[PDB]
């Protein structure tokens, strides 16, 4: 004994998924080419 144990909430901070590798923390999503705009989608003109 002489060592406490880690309970609810307390247990969570020790043992939740952390992304502890500086690299993957850094990253950002792909961007893209700007994708020039798109036409209308509907027309009464018929």
């Amino acid at each position: 004994s002489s060592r406490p144990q880690k309970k609810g909430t307390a247990h969570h901070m020790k043992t939740r998924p952390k992304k502890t590798a500086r690299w993957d923390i850094k990253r950002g999503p792909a961007v893209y080419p700007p994708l020039p705009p798109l036409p209308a989608e509907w027309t009464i003109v018929s």
Binding site: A30, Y32, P33, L35, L38
Partner: protein
């Protein structure tokens, strides 16, 4: 000035009818017919939003298999490097739908992507 009621019987026949094919006391025994009713509506919500989420999942795995059919290491991952680099306006995981109906077409898609 008695004011007695019958509006319960309708209040309650209505439910009594919405809980049909509930296979137990959940279909006869009014005082539980109520809470059952409540719980069917709730699972209607959760199963509805989860159905959007769930059909994405199903098409990801289905398109994923059609792409891996090429015997070389392709993916649903890398297929999308190459499907957005070449501007295709979002066939919306419904290329996963033709992938099972017009498979030759999906091989045409796939070859144009590889170029």
């Amino acid at each position: 000035r008695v004011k007695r009621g019958y509006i319960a019987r309708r209040r309650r026949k209505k439910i009594r009818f919405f809980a049909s094919s509930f296979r137990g006391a959940h279909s006869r025994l009014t005082r539980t017919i109520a809470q059952q009713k409540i719980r069917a509506l709730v699972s209607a919500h959760r199963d509805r939003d989860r159905q959007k989420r769930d059909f994405r999942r199903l098409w990801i795995t289905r398109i994923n298999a059609a792409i891996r059919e090429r015997g070389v290491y392709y993916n649903y991952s890398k297929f999308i490097h190459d499907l957005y680099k070449r501007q295709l306006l979002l066939n919306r995981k419904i290329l996963a739908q033709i992938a099972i109906l017009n498979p030759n077409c999906i091989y045409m898609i796939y070859n144009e992507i590889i170029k």
